[PDB]
Amino acid sequence: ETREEAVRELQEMVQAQAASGEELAVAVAERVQEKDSGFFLRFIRARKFNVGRAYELLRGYVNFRLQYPELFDSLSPEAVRCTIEAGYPGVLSSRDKYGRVVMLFNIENWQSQEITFDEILQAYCFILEKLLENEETQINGFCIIENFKGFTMQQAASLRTSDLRKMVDMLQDSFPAWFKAIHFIHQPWYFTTTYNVVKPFLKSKLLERVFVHGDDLSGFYQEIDENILPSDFGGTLPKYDGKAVAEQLF
């Protein structure tokens, strides 16, 4: 069967490339040695069974883990659960019109000293790992909705460029085959400074996936069904509660 053959070919390529001794190639081989066929199929299917292209995706995925080991070193499922229960980030029960999983972040009252940017990215990675077990999601991918209505100047001043770059790299290196769009709503005037900080690190393909809506949600609602969104993202569903997602995942 083509699936089993494709996985075997990807595995052989992982080994063949590592044979060169090239640093990342060697790291990939080491870092995927415990993975099952399902894991390899994610990359294979995301690249329409093009093994070479699947391997390139895998390189970026592993590179992210090499560059940001603090996100993976002492990962505790229990701690990740708490972050998710707190609603950071959230996940909708229904897919959007593109068949995408919709992830959520509402910055209002986010206290970075209580729940760190790193902890939030750990939660993203933990969720995406589970979400990508699903074969439709392996193709359709996901989007992110960011409600910045409550983005304060204090929050803005506290954001570290190294943390913003980490998020860029999560989307651009770890999950680029799956990250499809990010929608910022209700962002204040000083969002411009935050955006400008990140802009140099965004490749053109990723830049084209960033949308900023402010207070006019007309276009936004054309993308994401108002009737699938929680009330704190302008929708008709109950205010987002991280408990439901958390229970489903764990």
Ligand X SMILES: CC1=C(/C=C/C(C)=C/C=C\C(C)=C\C=O)C(C)(C)CCC1
Where is the binding site for 11-cis-retinal, in residues? 124, 146
- State which residue has the least CB distance to ligand X: 105
Give the nearer residue to ligand X in terms of CB position, either 49 or 201: 201
> Whole-number minimum distance, CB 38 to ligand X, in Å?
27
How many helices (H) and strands (E) are present in the chain, helices listed first? 13, 5
> Whole-number minimum distance, CB 130 to ligand X, in Å?
18
> Whole-number minimum distance, CB 146 to ligand X, in Å?
6
Q: Which residues belong to the annotated binding site? A: 124, 146
Give the nearer residue to ligand X in terms of CB position, either 107 or 127: 107
* Rounded CA separation 220/201 (Å): 25
DSSP conformation letters of 69-135: GGGTTT--HHHHHHHHHTTSSEE-SS--TTS-EEEEEE-TT--TTTS-HHHHHHHHHHHHHHHTTST
Give the nearer residue to ligand X in terms of CB position, either 31 or 186: 186
Half-sphere exposure of 41 (CA within 13 A, CB side): 15
Residues that bind ligand X (CB under 6 A): 89, 105, 107, 117, 120, 146, 164, 167-168, 182, 194-195, 198, 202, 210
Pull the structure tokens for residue 83: 């972050």
* Rounded CA separation 89/201 (Å): 23
Residue 69's CB: how many other CB atoms inside 10 A? Answer: 9
Widest distance between CA atoms in the chain: 56
Between the CA of residue 132 and those of 10, 151, 236, what are the distances in Å? 18, 30, 27
Give the nearer residue to ligand X in terms of CB position, either 79 or 198: 198
Give the nearer residue to ligand X in terms of CB position, either 57 or 145: 145
3-state secondary structure of 250: coil
> Whole-number minimum distance, CB 210 to ligand X, in Å?
5
> Whole-number minimum distance, CB 135 to ligand X, in Å?
26
